[PDB]
Every structure is written in structure tokens, then in C-alpha cells.
Amino acid sequence: AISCGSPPPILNGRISYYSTPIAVGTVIRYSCSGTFRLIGEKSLLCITKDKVDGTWDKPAPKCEYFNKYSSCPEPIVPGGYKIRGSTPYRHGDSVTFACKTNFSMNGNKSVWCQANNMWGPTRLPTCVS
Amino acid sequence: AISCGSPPPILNGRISYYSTPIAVGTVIRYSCSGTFRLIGEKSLLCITKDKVDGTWDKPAPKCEYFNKYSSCPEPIVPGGYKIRGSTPYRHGDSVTFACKTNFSMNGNKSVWCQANNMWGPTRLPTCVSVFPLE
Amino acid sequence: MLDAERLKHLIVTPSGAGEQNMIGMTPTVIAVHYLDETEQWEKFGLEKRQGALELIKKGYTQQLAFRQPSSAFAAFVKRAPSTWLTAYVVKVFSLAVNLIAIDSQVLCGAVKWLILEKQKPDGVFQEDAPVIHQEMIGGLRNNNEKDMALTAFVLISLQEAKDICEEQVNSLPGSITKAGDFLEANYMNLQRSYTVAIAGYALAQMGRLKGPLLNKFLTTAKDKNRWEDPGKQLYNVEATSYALLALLQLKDFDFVPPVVRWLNEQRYYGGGYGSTQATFMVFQALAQYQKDAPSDHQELNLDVSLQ
């Protein structure tokens, strides 16, 4: 049967318990200690895009030591708006976007405020007509 | 960086020559001999979704023995609308859909007209309401 | 049941912290809203209007001292923001928009926060930091059916700020639909007369109080004139005022009379400890009845200021 290999590790974090072999459809959950903040989506899904090999559906998220002083500027996406998360934007906070009518999204819809005061592991999504 | 392994083979078809190794971002093209019709996307892209594994973005398309009588009816998707494709739909022809305002698409946006008159390799795409309770 | 001296006692000077200031601001705001809407200043004394506008501005200005960076509110700036207080500020401020200068960044910033931070994917609004004066939230103090009761309460607030904020808050339309979907899907299961009245009004505003829902709403009334819950039925004036607003919204004029009559027999101008919601709501509802009356013969009762 199709499987995924060992999930990507996470420094200063934990990965939920999983059985072997890792079957398509398996969901893994990452988390961080109390003084750390998780940056990126917490659950990875074992999927198959070509019906032959298995891959996790996204990169593993990371744990950043908490920086109570960090703050990210308002994330703005022309053609779109926020459907989750609002100011102030602190370390570990997340924002989720949606595109206005007649606009379609490109890229990941959610971003995280990182310790270096910049948004998510990926670039802000874009909205095009 | 990352590379994709040997691509899926295609019965009664061939893959456009590609150089080795295969880096993410590389596109390869499938085609069927002339007495067959290609069902599925002809171009496969080497990508990485988790920054560790390199994979082909779709399964290999297939070659169906040509049937000149095959004719698919106009595909209809609730909450969606056709973007590409025009009647009549013959063997190997395809159409593409998009979801209307307030729906998200579940499935492949493009389907192909098969010898048995049924649409695409996958089930027609579906457009589901953005509103959970629907 | 109402006259000028009774209404005049509701004009008060606001003071206190983030919750206390709104308890004070409520009677004055609804009293002015009621007199303007019913066009009764001649009976009350139009020269008192200016003075009331000044107290309203004072209430508003003072409340800003408790506006947080998020645009949400709490009793004290050191305290975690209340979903309910923030929504109540929107409910009061929206009524004052053409009375004094209300900053849309303030009004709409609070609306935006409610949606972006306190509404679940399923549409329910959640309170993560309950107010200290549990006295001021009326029927919501009884935590039973809180997801439905609070969701209706916040949605009604959002409807008041919709036209003013829809431009600056793109998530507003979708938030309302989600809240509405949740209330509609779970309405039939309500047990309290209070929740039935408040969610009933919220659904009526969206044209969703129909069929079995409408029937439950109407049959829930006791003696066909009030929405009350046995055992500490202190929320009946508030519940029934929401219900009267739903009936007016539905133009269900044949069912309205016993309700207005019951409301008019209550000492609804009493004010006093814990009267904030009853006060805001009964004056909103009776003002609405009088505002609608000139267009519909069926609303013929006299619930106006008497000599």
C-alpha cells in the first residue's frame, strides 16, 4: 500500500503518536512547549498526488522561543480581506485571508506572525480576478 | 535541491524526452499514439509539497483506443460554471470548471470525455458552500 | 404607564469604569432615541435635548478610555476583553451615530474584532472574559443556552452597525450569514422563553423566522402576551421587548396587542439595579411600535407619554 515516510522533525516541539507504516490519509499533529510558539499549520496529512508515492501535504511547522516584544505589521492583501485574526499582531498569532468576489486566491490563505516581526513561513497570498 | 524520480509509465503512449536528474519545476509531456485518445492532463510537474519529498503533481494520463462515436453530454456542476470547453464533446475532448461566488471546489477542475461517454478520469468536480451549515 | 417625569429620571450622568459607564450611558441614550423616534419632545421639553446630547457625548468619550488596542472593550484596560461588552458598546453607539460624532474606526473596529477574533467557524460568538456586572446583561446571566443566546445578542448588534460598517469590514456579510445559519439550525431545540425571544428577533430580521420556527416563537408566549421563564422571571420585560420587535418586524399585527398591553402594565421605566437590558430594550421596542403606528392602523394602542 502507498505510504509516507517518517514525518519531518520539529525542534523544541512534539509530534503526535502515529502507527507504522504511515498510510495515505494519516494525520500528524505538531505542537510546541509552553514558552514556544508554533509557526505554520499544526497538522500534516499523508497524501498521494501521483497515485504511486506518498508525501506529507505540507512542510512541518516550527517552534520559535516566545518573544513577547515581537509584533507584525498589518498584513494586507489587495483584492482580499481577513476572515480571521486582527490587530494587535503578536508572536505566534495567525491571520486567515479570503478573496473578494471575482477574485481567486494564490498561495496559502493563513500566515503567522514570526519572531523576526514578519509574516508566516510562506509569503502572503494573492487575489487575482 | 529536490528531485523527482522516474515518472509513471503510460500504456500505448510516450513521454517527451527529459534530461536526468529531474528538478522540481520540471514539466514533462505525455502523448498517445494516433489511434488512441489521451484522457487526463498531458503535462506533469515535478513539485514538492513538504520540502522533503519530490513528487509528480498528478498521475500519468491514459491512452484510450479511439472511438469516433463517443459523445459526452454537457457536464453540469451545481455552484459552478464552465470556463473552457465547447460542444460537441468527442473522445479525448475536455472541459474546465470554476466554482461560483460562495463555493469552494472539491476535485479536479478539468475532465476528459471518455470512450464510454462518461466524464474525466476523476468524478466531475464539486462546488461546496463556503458556509459550513451550508 | 409612561409620562414625562417618569422618563426624565432616566436622563443621567455617566461615570465609572468600562462597564459602569455603559450602565450609566444606557438610559440616556435610549431615552433620547425614544423621544426622537416617537417625536415626543414637545411633551417632554425640547430644550432638554441639548443637555442630553452632551451627557451622551460625555458617556461616549469616557468609554474610549477603555477601548483596547484590539478595538475591544473591558471594564479595565488590564482586563481581558469582553465579547459581550464589546458587542454592547456597538449596540449602544450605533444608536448614537446621528446624535453625536461617533468615530467609525471605533465602532467598526469593535465590529471587526468580534468577527475576526470571537466567532467560531460554526458561526457561534464566544465570550472569553465575562463582565463583572453580571447584573447588566439581562437574560444572558442565566448561562443556559449561552451559545445561542450570546450569538443572537451579538448578531443583533452587528445588524445595527451593518450599513455603517459594511464597507470597512468585508467579513461582515459572511459573519452574519454564519451566525444566522447557526441560530436557524438550532432554534427548534430551545427551551428558555428568553432565548426563543432574542434568537426569534435575530431570525426575524433576516426573514428566517418562518414555519415551525415562527410557530415555536409564537406558541412560546405565556397567555399570548409575554415570553417568561418560571423561577426568577426577571428577564420577561427584556425578552418580551425583543419578541415585540420580532412581531413588528414580521408585521404580525393580530398578535401584537396583548403583548403591548402586558408591557404597558409593567413598571418598565423603573431603572434600578440590573435594569440595563430591560431598559434599553423596552424603550427600543415601544419606540419602534410608535414609529410604525402612523403607517399601520392596526397599531392603534396609546403607549405614549401621558399628561
Ligand SMILES: CC(=O)N[C@@H]1[C@@H](O)[C@H](O)[C@@H](CO)O[C@@H]1O
Ligand atoms: C460583486 C461583484 O463584483 N459581482 C459582479 C456582478 O455584479 C456581475 O453580474 C458579474 C458578471 O461577470 O461580475 C461580478 O460577479
Ligand SMILES: CC(=O)N[C@@H]1[C@@H](O)[C@H](O)[C@@H](CO)O[C@@H]1O
Ligand atoms: C454571489 C453571492 O451569492 N454573493 C453572496 C453575497 O450576496 C452575501 O452577502 C454573502 C454573505 O452571505 O455571501 C456571498 O458573498
Ligand SMILES: [Zn+2]
Ligand atoms: Zn480587512
Ligand SMILES: [Zn+2]
Ligand atoms: Zn487572533
